[PDB]
Every structure is written in structure tokens, then in C-alpha cells.
């Protein structure tokens, strides 16, 4: 049978890729965790060695005919091995789009702008450009950084950009794909499994049904925001127009976290920043990430590997070693698992390792699962996975319980309202930016944007979709969305969307789980094995079953709802309901600062 | 591409080969 003929071929393949995928993961590893050019050629000949495997790979499982199988695990298996990639190019062109790839990934990271009108040391993104978008308060100046980034980085990104549209075309097309676009949306693809099937359009329908009855909640924000924007960006805010892009607290308005200090509802309450208690306390980023351990435990899960405390990097090495900082997790294989952290000792990077030690967990718990299932069950559920685990960690009776605030300062409605603002600032303010966001590439690989017209219909949506106005007029000789990471680094983007649904959608379960009493927003299960089993038995199966059927294994749905992130922050949405009473709910594009 | 994820984060390219 073919079949079993196949069933051989997957055995043979994941002995020699778990060893040559090791081998590559460890010299990334290396690598960011000592930058030499030693490092890199090493990471260099790792993945030339894991891609032609790859390759090959591919053909092979090419010759197993998918309609022979009935089993479904090694359909998955074979279908992964057969999609994804397949060098459809010419070697011409599957190096140029190499070469566009790393050369817009180059300019970004390699990115200076200096003064339009004082040049004398341009400033980079990070940490300059970043620090003015995160900090300052004169709109002359949020307003140089910004144009600046997108008057160079996104105008010599312009032209590569296109180039990259078409090439990433052509090998969707020659990989049965409608368009580059079609593919990144096969990730939700479900097929063969009944009552469970997925389509690669039912995504962008859902994705907009979700969407709106959201516009709600984000209505009212935007309202809220605008107002306390007018109160200090003075002279430049419409009462009923869009927010200028250059004054959302980063450098996109991605997030709106860094508006509190210009939006908190009551400045009297102390902020819940236990930074300082941390401090008093001194914890080290042992303890932070020990700490962290002694969370899963609780639900029922196992320690760390000790392995993963001789080899993980959860402090910054220092100025002997250059390491690129970006909290991170590993999965080698062979048992072998880090985090790669600079760790800062703060209430965020207290946050985040909750977050990074989520998803060695779900990497852990589908380690059971042959290679090619030992991944999260789509792009959205690794995610989701280390969220959930901040949303517990800030619960103050977390911070109580844990020690970092003291037993006294109750909550009252006005601290609750602090945060349910804290974070709508961040998980509701990016849903309507990376919808839009994504929306945009949906449409420009499916042709329908000409590039004649592509920065038009750009600001023509964020007005739209997001209420965000260019407080400068651009060209087409502008590439505003290549300004950001995720554009120019080759990445779907719409993760964050579905991520952001999934973990409210998985929260609310395992705190019904916790048998919690008050609301979604004070759930710790800190001390709950029963839902730590409920997640178990959805992280342990990796990408083994669909998505949808692993999203019902806990929820009960095949489908993100909103309807659970809509209870979530529901007693802000009436308060902000009453303050946006006699203030005006929603935008007009019309409006322009530059009018 | 990518069969299997080393990081959860995404990196730049030029972190990778
Ligand atoms: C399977 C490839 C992979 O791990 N990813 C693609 N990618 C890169 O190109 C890294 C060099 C981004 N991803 C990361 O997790 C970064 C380490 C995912
Ligand atoms: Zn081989
Ligand atoms: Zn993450």
C-alpha cells in the first residue's frame, strides 16, 4: 500500500531532520546569543543544509499522492512536506526574492534617519526614533520622526517592495495559490476533517463579521482618546476627525500602551506598576523566571527542564558578547529547551516571561508528537498561549497572593477602570491597526490596489478602519507599511487578530474551569490543575488535529468569538459609553491636519 | 515554508540564513 509505502517515508524523515533541525536551531541559538561573524557563517551553513533537505524532501513526498492516503495524521504530515515553498521559481528568481528579502530586512535594521533641517548624527528606530514616538510630548518632533522613517526607510523600500509582490505572486500562483495572499491564509485551511473544514476565504469573513461588533467598543475609546489627546496635543485635534498617525505612543500606532500618562482615567490611584516592590524586594531574573515555573506547576504542569536552566540566557551576557535582545523561546529538539532574555528586572519582563514560558510549554506537552505535528495549531494559538498566562500574572490577587502588593489596597471600580483602560490601550487599540493593516497586503496581492494607487487607498483605510488621519500628505513615492517589521520581514500579520480572540475565547473557559466567581478580569488560576489539564489536553496534540477541532476541545466553537473579549472589558464600554455622552463617537476622513 | 518553529517570536531575516 501506499499508505505504509509513505508511512516509511515519514519514519526515515523525521530521524534525519530532527537531527539536522537541531543542528540549525542550535546555531541560531549561538548566534543571537553571541553575535560573531564566526556565528553567522555557522547559522548560514546550518539552514543552506536544513533548506536543501527540505527541498528534497518536498519532491519525495510529491510521489505520495494525497487521494491513495485515508489516514488524516499522515496526510498532514505529507501535505506540510509537499506545500510550503517548493522553489516553484527559476534559481534566478528564487534568489533575487532572496536577496529583496534580506536587503528590506537589511534596511530596516540597518535604518537611520537624521534632522531634515539639523543633520549632523541621524538617529536609528530603535532605540531613538522609538524613545521620541514612545516619550515626547511636541508634536514638531513625534511629527520629524515619524515622516523622516517613511520619507527614507519606506521610500528606498518602495521600489523592492513591488518586486517582491510580483515574484511572491508568481510562486503562490505556481503553489496553486490565487495569490501570495491566498497562501499566508492557507494556515486556517481546514480540509477533510467533517463538520471541521476550513476554507482559506472563511478567515477574511470571519475576520470582518469579529471585527465588527467590535466597532462598539473601539468607537468609544477612539472617542476617549481623542479627547484626552486634545486636551494635550492642543491646537491639532479634530473633535470629530481622525487621530494624527505620529501621536499614538509608538511609531504606527500599532499600540496606544504609552497614551496612559495622557489618558488614565484617575491620575489619584497609584499605578499598579510593582516595578518598585520588585526592587524593595530585589528579585533577580532567577527569581523572576523561577517564579514564573512555580506558575505552571501549580495548574499542574512540570517543571522546567534542567537543562533548560544550564543552557537558557535570561540576563543580558554583557559587552564581552553582542546578543540580539528580543525576548525569546527555543525548541531544538532533543529534549533541549531555552528562552533567550535580557531580562530587565520590571513589571513588563516580570509579564513577559510568563509569556515566553507559555510557549515552552505547549512545546513541550506535543514533543510526544512526530516532527512535522510538533507545532502550535495554527499561527495564532502559540500566542494566545503566552497571553493568557499575563492576563493572570497582573491580577492583583495574583500580585497579592504572590507578594509583590501587599495584602491591603483593595480593588475599588476606579483601579478596575485603570485597568480595563491599560489594556484596551494595547489589545483592543492593534485589532482595527492590524486589520486594516493586513487588509491592505489581502488586497494588493489580489491585484485589486494598482500601485498608481497604492498609498492612496494606504490613508484612504486608515481613516476608515482605524480613524487615523497622515498628518502629511504621500506619494507614491512613499512605502508607509514596508516602514513597519512584519511588511518588510516577509510575515503574516493577521495572527495578532486571531490570537487576541483565542485567548479571551481560551481564558474564560479555563477560569469557568477555575470555577472563578467575579469577572474575566481578576482570574488568576494560579492554584488550578483542572484547568491546567483542560489546556494540556489541547497543547499536547500540536498541530496533530485542526484548529478547530482543538479550539472545541476546551471552548466549545470550531470559530473565534468576540463575544467573550466583548465581556471582558464590558465595564469600561458602558463607562465609556457615559463619558463619551456629550462627546462625539466616531470620525470623519474628510478631516486633514495638512488640510 | 518552516515545517517546524525554533523561536515563538519572529526574528529579522537577517537573523537567519
Ligand atoms: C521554520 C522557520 C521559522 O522558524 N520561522 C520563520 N522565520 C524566520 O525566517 C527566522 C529566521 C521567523 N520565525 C521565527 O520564529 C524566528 C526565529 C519563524
Ligand atoms: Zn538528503
Ligand atoms: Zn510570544
Known sequence: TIEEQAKTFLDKFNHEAEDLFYQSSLASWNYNTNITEENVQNMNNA????????????????????????????????????????????????????????????????????????????????????????????????????????????????????????????????????????????????????????????????????????????????????????????????????????????????????????????????????????????????????????????????????????????????????????????????????????????????????????????????????????????????????????????????????????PDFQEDNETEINFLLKQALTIVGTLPFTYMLEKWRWMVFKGEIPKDQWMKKWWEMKREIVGVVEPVPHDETYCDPASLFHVSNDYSFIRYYTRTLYQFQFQEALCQAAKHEGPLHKCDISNSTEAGQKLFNMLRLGKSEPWTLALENVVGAKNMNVRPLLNYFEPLFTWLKDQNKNSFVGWSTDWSPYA | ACVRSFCSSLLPRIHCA
Open chain 1, 47 to 406: 539552514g543552506d543544509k536544513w533548506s536543501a533537505f527540505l527541498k528534497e524532501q518536498s519532491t519525495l513526498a510529491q510521489m505520495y499522492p494525497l487521494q491513495e492516503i485515508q489516514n488524516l495524521t499522515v496526510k498532514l504530515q505529507l501535505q506540510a512536506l509537499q506545500q510550503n515553498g517548493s522553489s516553484v521559481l527559476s534559481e534566478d528568481k528564487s534568489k533575487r526574492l532572496n536577496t529583496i528579502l534580506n536587503t528590506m530586512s537589511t534596511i530596516y535594521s540597518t535604518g537611520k534617519v537624521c534632522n531634515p533641517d539639523n543633520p549632523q548624527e541621524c538617529l536609528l528606530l530603535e532605540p531613538g526614533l522609538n524613545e521620541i514616538m514612545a516619550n515626547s510630548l511636541d508634536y514638531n518632533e513625534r511629527l520629524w520622526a515619524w515622516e523622516s522613517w517613511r520619507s527614507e526607510v519606506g521610500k528606498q523600500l518602495r521600489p523592492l517592495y513591488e518586486e517582491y509582490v510580483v515574484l511572491k505572486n508568481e510562486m503562490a500562483r505556481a503553489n496553486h495559490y490565487e495569490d501570495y495572499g491566498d497562501y499566508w491564509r492557507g494556515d486556517y485551511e481546514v480540509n477533510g476533517v467533517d463538520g471541521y473544514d476550513y476554507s482559506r476565504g472563511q478567515l477574511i469573513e470571519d475576520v470582518e463579521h469579529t471585527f465588527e461588533e467590535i466597532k462598539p467598543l473601539y468607537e468609544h475609546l477612539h472617542a476617549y482618546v481623542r479627547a484626552k489627546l486634545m486636551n494635550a496635543y492642543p491646537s491639532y485635534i479634530s473633535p470629530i476627525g481622525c487621530l494624527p498617525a505620529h501621536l499614538l505612543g509608538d511609531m504606527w500606532g500599532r499600540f496606544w500602551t504609552n497614551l496612559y500618562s495622557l489618558t488614565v482615567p484617575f491620575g489619584q490611584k497609584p499605578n499598579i506598576d510593582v516595578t518598585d516592590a520588585m526592587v524593595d524586594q530585589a528579585w533577580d531574573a532567577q527569581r523572576i523566571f523561577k517564579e514564573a515555573e512555580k506558575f505552571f506547576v501549580s495548574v499542574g504542569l512540570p517543571n522546567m527542564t534542567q537543562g533548560f536552566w544550564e543552557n537558557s540566557m535570561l540576563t543580558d551576557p554583557g559587552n564581552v558578547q553582542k546578543a540580539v535582545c528580543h525576548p525569546t523561546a527555543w525548541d531544538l529538539g532533543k529534549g533541549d529547551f531555552r528562552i533567550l532574555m535580557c531580562t530587565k528586572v520590571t513589571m513588563d519582563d516580570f509579564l513577559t516571561a510568563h509569556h515566553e514560558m507559555g510557549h515552552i510549554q505547549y512545546d513541550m506537552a506535543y514533543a510526544a508528537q512526530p516532527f512535522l505535528l510538533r507545532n502550535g495549531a495554527n499561527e495564532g494559538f502559540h500566542e494566545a498561549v503566552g497571553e493568557i498566562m499575563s492576563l493572570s500574572a497582573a491580577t492583583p490577587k495574583h500580585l497579592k497572593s504572590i507578594g509583590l502588593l501587599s
